[PDB]
Design a protein around this ligand. Structure first.
Ligand SMILES: CCCCCCCCCCCCCCCCC[C@@H](O)O[C@H](CO[C@H](O)CCCCCCCCCCCCCCC)COP(=O)(O)OCC[N+](C)(C)C
Ligand SMILES: CCCCCCCC/C=C\CCCCCCCC(=O)O[C@H](COC(=O)CCCCCCC/C=C/CCCCCCCC)COP(=O)(O)OCCN
Lengths: 83, 70
């Protein structure tokens, strides 16, 4: 406790650049695993259409697959508009 | 007395020789058969031996590929 605080205070003197760099690097390592918006970034990346959406040949056994883009079923992007 | 105390009868050696000869004859014919089998498998490749790997077909991706013609 006392030794660690003394070491950190001694480093903050005559070595502030190293203290700042190590703090910033540790924050970069730690914070993404705790932020709630990383999953939002993953969802945004998965929502970017780079390829043509190839239609499925319908067999009468897909209630969840829409027939038209206007149909209610299918993934929605309202959350992205909200952000 | 010498025969009774130091040695055995002729049947013992006779039948031991018979068994030894059987073992050696089967070993010889097995050696020839194995050489021929190895030659056949190496030539034709249809046996369990000399099986050289080919590409695993579970690696192939079967999905639409941004272009209709693969
Ligand atoms: C007047 C006498 C005339 C005959 C003289 C005989 C001389 C005998 C000594 C010479 C022996 C020749 C060598 C034999 C070695 C092989 C013998 C061996 O096969 O017999 C084994 C037994 O070996 C003997 O005990 C070896 C005897 C060694 C001593 C020989 C005599 C001289 C010994 C001197 C010792 C001196 C020590 C110091 C003294 C002061 C048991 O055999 P086993 O595999 O079951 O046989 C199966 C068939 N059966 C069941 C019918 C038997
Ligand atoms: C875990 C995250 C890692 C990623 C982030 C870091 C990225 C870049 C930083 C690392 C670069 C390499 C650093 C190499 C360290 C060298 C240390 C050294 O020996 O130099 C000392 C200088 O500094 C020292 O005394 C050694 C290091 C002392 C401690 C430095 C900081 C340690 C950690 C501090 C921060 C802890 C966590 C952050 C909390 C901050 C408070 C909120 C000697 O100086 P000389 O140039 O040799 O001159 C000799 C004549 N005097």
């Amino acid at each position: 406790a006392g030794r660690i605080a003394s070491f950190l205070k001694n480093a903050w003197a005559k070595e502030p650049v190293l203290v700042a760099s190590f703090a910033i690097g540790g924050l970069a390592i730690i914070l993404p695993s705790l932020s709630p918006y990383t999953n939002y970034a993953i969802r945004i990346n998965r929502a970017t259409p780079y390829n043509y959406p190839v239609p499925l040949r319908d067999d009468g056994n897909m209630p969840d697959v829409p027939s038209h883009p206007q149909d209610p079923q299918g993934p929605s992007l309202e959350w992205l508009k909200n952000l | 007395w010498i025969a009774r105390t130091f040695y055995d009868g002729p049947e013992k050696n006779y039948e031991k020789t018979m068994a030894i000869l059987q073992i050696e004859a089967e070993k010889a014919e097995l050696r020839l058969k194995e050489l021929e089998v190895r030659r056949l498998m190496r030539a034709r490749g249809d046996g369990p031996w000399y099986q050289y790997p080919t590409i695993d077909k579970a690696l192939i991706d079967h999905s639409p590929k941004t272009t209709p013609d693969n």
